[PDB]
Design a protein around this motif. Sequence first.
Motif, mmCIF file in Angstrom:
data_model
loop_
_atom_site.group_PDB
_atom_site.id
_atom_site.type_symbol
_atom_site.label_atom_id
_atom_site.label_comp_id
_atom_site.label_asym_id
_atom_site.label_seq_id
_atom_site.Cartn_x
_atom_site.Cartn_y
_atom_site.Cartn_z
ATOM 1 N N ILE A 213 16.535 57.654 -6.897
ATOM 2 C CA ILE A 213 16.883 56.935 -5.414
ATOM 3 C C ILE A 213 17.198 55.542 -5.365
ATOM 4 C CG2 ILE A 213 15.820 56.348 -3.180
ATOM 5 C CD1 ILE A 213 13.718 58.900 -4.516
ATOM 6 N N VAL A 214 18.636 55.210 -5.154
ATOM 7 C CA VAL A 214 19.358 53.905 -5.338
ATOM 8 C C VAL A 214 20.005 53.471 -3.614
ATOM 9 C CG1 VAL A 214 20.732 52.707 -6.524
ATOM 10 C CG2 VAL A 214 19.806 54.753 -7.676
ATOM 11 N N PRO A 215 19.277 52.596 -3.199
ATOM 12 C CA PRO A 215 19.652 51.949 -1.679
ATOM 13 C C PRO A 215 20.771 50.710 -2.287
ATOM 14 C CG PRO A 215 17.694 50.838 -2.549
ATOM 15 C CD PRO A 215 17.957 52.023 -3.688
ATOM 16 N N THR A 216 21.496 50.422 -1.178
ATOM 17 C CA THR A 216 22.498 49.280 -1.104
ATOM 18 C C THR A 216 21.618 47.899 -0.823
ATOM 19 O OG1 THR A 216 23.437 49.501 0.784
ATOM 20 C CG2 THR A 216 24.538 50.593 -1.067
ATOM 21 N N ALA A 217 20.317 48.143 -0.316
ATOM 22 C CA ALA A 217 19.574 47.330 0.085
ATOM 23 C C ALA A 217 18.181 47.572 0.125
ATOM 24 C CB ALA A 217 20.200 46.658 1.539
ATOM 25 N N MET A 218 17.369 46.417 0.015
ATOM 26 C CA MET A 218 16.014 46.606 0.303
ATOM 27 C C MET A 218 15.256 45.343 1.181
ATOM 28 S SD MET A 218 14.675 47.347 -3.692
ATOM 29 C CE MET A 218 13.204 47.752 -3.290
ATOM 30 N N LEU A 219 14.476 45.898 2.082
ATOM 31 C CA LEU A 219 13.535 45.147 2.831
ATOM 32 C C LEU A 219 12.203 45.042 2.312
ATOM 33 C CD1 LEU A 219 14.897 46.010 6.383
ATOM 34 C CD2 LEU A 219 15.062 43.615 5.364
ATOM 35 N N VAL A 220 11.777 43.962 1.982
ATOM 36 C CA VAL A 220 10.494 43.848 1.006
ATOM 37 C C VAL A 220 9.344 43.002 1.931
ATOM 38 C CG1 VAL A 220 9.588 43.329 -0.977
ATOM 39 C CG2 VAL A 220 11.633 43.984 -1.075
ATOM 40 N N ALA A 221 8.184 43.320 1.868
ATOM 41 C CA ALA A 221 7.184 42.851 2.814
ATOM 42 C C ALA A 221 6.653 41.428 2.315
ATOM 43 C CB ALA A 221 6.019 43.894 3.122
ATOM 44 N N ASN A 222 6.606 41.089 1.098
ATOM 45 C CA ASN A 222 6.352 39.691 0.659
ATOM 46 C C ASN A 222 7.322 39.211 -0.309
ATOM 47 O OD1 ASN A 222 5.130 40.766 -1.462
ATOM 48 N ND2 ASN A 222 3.414 39.209 -1.343
ATOM 49 N N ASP A 223 7.382 37.854 -0.645
ATOM 50 C CA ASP A 223 8.388 37.277 -1.821
ATOM 51 C C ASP A 223 7.944 37.894 -3.226
ATOM 52 O OD1 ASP A 223 9.790 36.397 0.406
ATOM 53 O OD2 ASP A 223 9.581 34.233 -0.445
ATOM 54 N N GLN A 224 6.574 37.920 -3.430
ATOM 55 C CA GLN A 224 6.230 38.206 -4.683
ATOM 56 C C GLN A 224 6.471 39.708 -5.222
ATOM 57 O OE1 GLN A 224 1.905 36.497 -4.077
ATOM 58 N NE2 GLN A 224 2.135 36.607 -6.232
ATOM 59 N N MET A 225 6.414 40.528 -3.958
ATOM 60 C CA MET A 225 6.967 41.793 -4.432
ATOM 61 C C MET A 225 8.573 41.934 -4.512
ATOM 62 S SD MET A 225 4.562 44.659 -2.392
ATOM 63 C CE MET A 225 5.161 44.159 -0.658
ATOM 64 N N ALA A 226 9.137 40.966 -3.702
ATOM 65 C CA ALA A 226 10.645 41.067 -3.981
ATOM 66 C C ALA A 226 11.056 40.458 -5.241
ATOM 67 C CB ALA A 226 11.214 39.674 -2.911
ATOM 68 N N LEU A 227 10.353 39.491 -6.061
ATOM 69 C CA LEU A 227 10.353 39.262 -7.338
ATOM 70 C C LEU A 227 10.516 40.140 -8.245
ATOM 71 C CD1 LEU A 227 10.681 36.752 -9.743
ATOM 72 C CD2 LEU A 227 8.203 36.776 -9.469
ATOM 73 N N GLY A 228 9.426 41.219 -8.130
ATOM 74 C CA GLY A 228 9.432 42.348 -8.747
ATOM 75 C C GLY A 228 10.411 43.410 -8.915
ATOM 76 N N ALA A 229 10.747 43.606 -7.443
ATOM 77 C CA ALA A 229 11.962 44.392 -7.026
ATOM 78 C C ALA A 229 13.128 43.788 -7.693
ATOM 79 C CB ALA A 229 11.993 44.455 -5.545
ATOM 80 N N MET A 230 13.269 42.599 -7.732
ATOM 81 C CA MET A 230 14.792 42.152 -8.372
ATOM 82 C C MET A 230 14.617 42.219 -9.917
ATOM 83 S SD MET A 230 14.516 38.544 -5.976
ATOM 84 C CE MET A 230 15.582 37.733 -7.265
ATOM 85 N N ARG A 231 13.525 42.205 -10.522
ATOM 86 C CA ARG A 231 13.430 42.441 -11.937
ATOM 87 C C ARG A 231 13.715 43.892 -12.214
ATOM 88 N NH1 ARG A 231 7.972 43.652 -15.547
ATOM 89 N NH2 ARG A 231 9.588 44.579 -17.195
ATOM 90 N N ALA A 232 13.130 44.861 -11.436
ATOM 91 C CA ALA A 232 13.264 46.205 -11.564
ATOM 92 C C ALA A 232 14.741 46.630 -11.411
ATOM 93 C CB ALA A 232 12.586 47.173 -10.440
ATOM 94 N N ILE A 233 15.286 45.870 -10.438
ATOM 95 C CA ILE A 233 16.834 46.197 -9.866
ATOM 96 C C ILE A 233 17.785 45.664 -11.385
ATOM 97 C CG2 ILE A 233 19.014 45.337 -8.666
ATOM 98 C CD1 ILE A 233 16.802 45.088 -6.305
#
Lengths: 300, 300, 300, 300
Positions: D177-197
């Motif tokens: 499952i691969v979106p073109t975009a993510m809405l993330v509920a905080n910045d620390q979780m966004a950091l992790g998401a960016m690492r995984a991307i």
Amino acid sequence: SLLIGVATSSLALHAPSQIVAAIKSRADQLGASVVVSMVERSGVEACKAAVHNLLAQRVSGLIINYPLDDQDAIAVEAACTNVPALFLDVSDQTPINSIIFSHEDGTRLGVEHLVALGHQQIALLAGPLSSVSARLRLAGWHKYLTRNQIQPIAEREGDWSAMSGFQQTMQMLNEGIVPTAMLVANDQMALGAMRAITESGLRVGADISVVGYDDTEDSSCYIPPLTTIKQDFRLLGQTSVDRLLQLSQGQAVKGNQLLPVSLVKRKTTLAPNTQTASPRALADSLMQLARQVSRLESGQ
Amino acid sequence: SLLIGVATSSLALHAPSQIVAAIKSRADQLGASVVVSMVERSGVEACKAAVHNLLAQRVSGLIINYPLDDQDAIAVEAACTNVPALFLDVSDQTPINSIIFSHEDGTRLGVEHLVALGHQQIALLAGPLSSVSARLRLAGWHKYLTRNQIQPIAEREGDWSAMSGFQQTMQMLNEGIVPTAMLVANDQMALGAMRAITESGLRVGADISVVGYDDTEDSSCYIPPLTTIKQDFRLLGQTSVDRLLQLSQGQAVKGNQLLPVSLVKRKTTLAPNTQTASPRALADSLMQLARQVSRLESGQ
Amino acid sequence: SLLIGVATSSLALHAPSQIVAAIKSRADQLGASVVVSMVERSGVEACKAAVHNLLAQRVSGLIINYPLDDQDAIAVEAACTNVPALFLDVSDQTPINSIIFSHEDGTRLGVEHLVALGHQQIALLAGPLSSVSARLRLAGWHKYLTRNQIQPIAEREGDWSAMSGFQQTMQMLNEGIVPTAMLVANDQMALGAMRAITESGLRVGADISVVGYDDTEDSSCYIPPLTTIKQDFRLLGQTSVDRLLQLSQGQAVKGNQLLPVSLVKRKTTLAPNTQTASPRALADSLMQLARQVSRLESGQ
Amino acid sequence: SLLIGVATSSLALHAPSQIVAAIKSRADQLGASVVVSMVERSGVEACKAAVHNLLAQRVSGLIINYPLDDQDAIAVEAACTNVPALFLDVSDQTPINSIIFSHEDGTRLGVEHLVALGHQQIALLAGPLSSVSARLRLAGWHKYLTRNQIQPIAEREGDWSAMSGFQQTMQMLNEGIVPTAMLVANDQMALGAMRAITESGLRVGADISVVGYDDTEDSSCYIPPLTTIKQDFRLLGQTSVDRLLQLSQGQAVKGNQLLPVSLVKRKTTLAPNTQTASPRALADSLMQLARQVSRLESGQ
């Protein structure tokens, strides 16, 4: 307080377990308490006994997550007396208060996914026909397959367990019956089917494609991860608690509501044995190789 | 007559679901009723809330299947006032009424199994260490590895879910830590670990052996079938119901009971493998995939 | 009902927050209470004011987690009158009760790691040198570099924030000073350094290796994950609360204690001569290629 | 002589730490003192216990920076008895004194940014739904996506931490499952998401766009710098203290105030990538990589 009663089928099965956990999570958020009565697989009378139990516990409304036919559901509702009851495993046709996943869409989506991939030789692994959800699902598969001019090559009945999925699939393959795809009535049975396929020396996806039903929590961690019809149990538990409270406040919110479902594409379905490997399959192989290449490194 | 209240950790985890199912089964056999209250992962506060929930329902006794540290377990027992409480997820050192599986045996069995096969490079995948049972398992693994003159090459912590098994194991492998065997704190996390091994380009059993813990229902249908430590949840359900009835009549049965465990050897453990893949072999597979990629336009 | 007062740094820096969280967990375990006073940037007078405020709250003991120069720490201790005081951000040579992490080992470990990788052109990114810990760290780097016959090619001072790491590193690079590795005084500044390196078109690791200090919680999730000196703040919290309670009891446990640190090797440190088609770079390129291959699927 | 009590969730999360630091700066400016009681645990009794610690300290008012469901918030307010209490992490529908950032605007802004950019395949990464702010954010995203005739293609739940962001995002992506975009509920979780991307072989921004929430301090130094919804915590601190002082002087404009938020555009959002490589060119690049891999068969 504010107390919700839940009558549930064997929490040995993963889907009912996730439903009660979703119900509990929503209850907590609203400051409602929940008490659960577990129903033995005997049927309406066991379910009626649980409801009586729950009514003795002075519950303000009932969520009935147990498979009931049209008249049994009505009978169980009547036993609820004044307190509101919401049914979670019935036909959308039964004139009671209910929230149900769309079986028409779940069945269609699985069929069309396989048909659009090029499968013609499709086997069906049904749940126990004593369950209204199993009946609804099997009948739907039949409908959409015949609509696409396919009759399944074989048809087996499990009991919702992984072992039944293995034993049924293994016996089908042992009879010399080899489909290119299977539709399976839950993900636990789908695991067993997948194991049977693998231990026959066939590859899940590439040789025999498999579609489950539920997207219960482990399914993403099956080998390969399982393509399945997602029924969002968190949504169900949330909507069912909100609706039970609407009902208890006298909100004119009576009858059936359907919940949508979707197909989660993972790694258990590919076009049938055609001499061009699929992009998604190639990509997964390349990712696996990438991990092996990276470990060719040192350790400081 | 007679109402047994069960306070349970989330039924979204398979061991707890199987345990309440087994409790219900024995209760039904004896003519006792069961009411279940489910508890959130918050700890002692959440456990007390559920205990209070059940105490309102006028239960004859409480079975508490929820992890509680020594002080917290005592606190929860104090909260039961005049009704007997029986704890199923505590240290056997806490001075309350408990029935607990032998963690000494379960951990020893796992360690000794792998050592006897020839493993010396062993990774531990722990349950969340807020759970006393996770901590007892982790401590037992350390005890017995040490008796066997081994330090584990890695030690990671999951949350009991398959996804946590997958994530922790993938991360370990991606650091270039590649054990010959893993000891995992439950079977659901083992399922995830197996997927991670596989998608890292390694074979479960052959390249990395895996021992789970629980023998929950699906484990015999994992791919490959999972070698695991069986904890007989039917035995715990039956003995816990009987024990509660004994306690409720004030019979001389206070204290802790240890239940036995066993090793179920299936298909996920072999002697350790030596040889790694060569760059040339990896390159050869890549070239083969490149040829398949090329025929996605011309060559089909 | 024993009440621990903590005076802490008020910059929402991640290390001090983790430390107070760890103090609270240990306190919670022991049934002690905690009140926290936050201290503004300005030094001894601010810290004294915080002590008086905690003293007015009738605390049994004080934990001072705030950087104090030698004579300032002495002054803060004298402000503490009756009550035991334990300092967590001082030199280990100040004559007061303290627990600090070993800066000798932390600095040695970073230096010896880069040196063993073969780096010779090393830049230092210090914390604000008003902080005794920043000074201890910078002094340590110089010490172990000199013992390995290396002098740093640049030394800059940040303020513990990520943006200072970015700004100082960009400036260094804009002066034409391009080291093959950097030692950075905390992980937040290291993040900024890493951004500067990346935005200047250089690869973190292969072009400029980075070693942080602390292993604050986010660091395993930087890009790439950060090699750092772990200071176990849970250990600091536990030992500090125990030690403070011992001091309140008149245990003869006065003076300084040093805690161990360790090197956490992740993905920001490599040899400076890395060949372009290394395992790591090849694997990253393969993953990217695999993703492009997966995109060729559509309407399947 | 004016003493403000703050009951706060763990300071190990960056947003609460920034909020407490902002409270402290404002009090300093006013001549007021602040005492902080930390609630490391989840639950209303954990929160009431903090309130009790603080009241024992003769605080002239309380700021409650801890997530509270509507009824638990009312319960905690009752526990405050005579001293004014101001809540920072509640629904704006709760009948208590509160200051809250506008979730309607924050969610609208994130959604409308992605839509305006051309994104239709959007995944949601929620905070833990036990937190009311996490549920408010998740609800807002649904409302504004549905207003824009978009259903999210995936929806996962983290726990506020960077590692959960990484794991939830990695699990999704690798499930297939691969979106073109993510809405993330905080910045620390966004950091992790960016690492995984990034570690999945995709580019943050160019392949998958990411929008955080908070603009916590490190966010401008993520890689790339994170586009996010800024909640101004300096403003929250300043306004909350001022409001508390008004309340404690009975200039009691009571109930809820909403603070505005804003979109901070940085470098993690772009139009969705529509380009797509030719199979021949991918096969050619793969063969080149294969040869470089083979070359490692021992060549430096």
